[PDB]
Design a protein around this ligand. Structure first.
Ligand SMILES: COc1ccc2c(c1CN1CCNCC1)O/C(=C\c1c[nH]c3cccnc13)C2=O
Length: 270
């Protein structure tokens, strides 16, 4: 009764997400219902309370401002958890944005990719690994030109040792996962970021099948500058240790002179 429930925004086997309004101040929110039977990965609060890892991860990153969706509150029900999340308005996810506009001008792709990089750096700094970076999980605040990372439902605490579990998106998953069901956090993130950048500048992902992912041969179907092509192929290095660090990505020549978010909005969104 504390929130006015609006239309369904999306759903899966994990659960369902509704547009909503906080009654007290009319704040736009998203109301995410997570089925207890579909969680798999349980976390624990400091106070000791088994919650979805998603709640743990969001609290670790929901602190000050960033390009990460804020968790405003959460509730437990007999068979589910309910998460109350920030909702920008107007908003569009990157998948829909690219679907409508096609391949993005590199100046726009640079701005978006830079903001995603800053958001992911914030997560890793907070000890959080997202594990499902992709266009569908990136919201665009259309008025402000600001991007926000969503859905930490496949995430994990960041660690320096190998991960053997994965339930993110396969076509964004690295060849070492496909081949050996093993990956390390940062290098796997960088791979998905390579897929994402290709998606931005070409208007579709580079690989569809397992065999393409493990071959790692990148074909460009759109005109893309040599510098951008280089960064993409670097992020998509077959050997994980050959991939760039976040610092190397942001220091790449293609990444220089990024637009401010409001400039990005004024030029590309308005
Ligand atoms: C299958 O649909 C899902 C799954 C997980 C999440 C989710 C949605 C709904 N749509 C999100 C964009 N891509 C299409 C699906 O939304 C989330 C968080 C949100 C926080 N504020 C928002 C505002 C507008 C939409 N979503 C959110 C999620 O974790």
């Amino acid at each position: 009764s504390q929130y006015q429930v609006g239309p369904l925004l999306g759903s899966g086997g994990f659960g369902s997400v509704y547009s909503g309004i906080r009654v007290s101040d009319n704040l736009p929110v998203a109301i995410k219902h997570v089925e207890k039977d579909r969680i798999s990965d349980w976390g624990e609060l400091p106070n000791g309370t088994r919650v979805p890892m998603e709640v743990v991860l969001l609290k670790k990153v929901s602190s000050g401002f960033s390009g990460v969706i804020r968790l405003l509150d959460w509730f437990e029900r007999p068979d589910s958890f309910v998460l109350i999340l920030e909702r920008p308005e107007p908003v569009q996810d990157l998948f829909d944005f690219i679907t409508e506009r096609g391949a993005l001008q590199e100046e726009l792709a640079r701005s978006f990719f830079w903001q995603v990089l800053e958001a992911v750096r914030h997560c890793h700094n907070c000890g959080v690994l997202h594990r499902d970076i992709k266009d569908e999980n990136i919201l665009i605040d259309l008025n402000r030109g600001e991007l926000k990372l969503i859905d930490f439902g496949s995430g994990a605490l960041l660690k320096d040792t190998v991960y053997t579990d994965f339930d993110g998106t396969r076509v964004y998953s690295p060849p070492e996962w496909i081949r050996y069901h093993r990956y390390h956090g940062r290098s796997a993130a960088v791979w998905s970021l390579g897929i994402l950048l290709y998606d931005m500048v070409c208007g579709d992902i580079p690989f569809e099948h397992d065999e393409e992912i493990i071959r790692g041969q990148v074909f460009f179907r759109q005109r893309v500058s040599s510098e951008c092509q280089h960064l993409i192929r670097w992020c998509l290095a077959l050997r994980p240790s050959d991939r760039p660090t976040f610092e190397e990505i942001q220091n790449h020549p293609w990444m220089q002179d990024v637009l401010l978010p409001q400039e990005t909005a004024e030029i590309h969104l308005h």
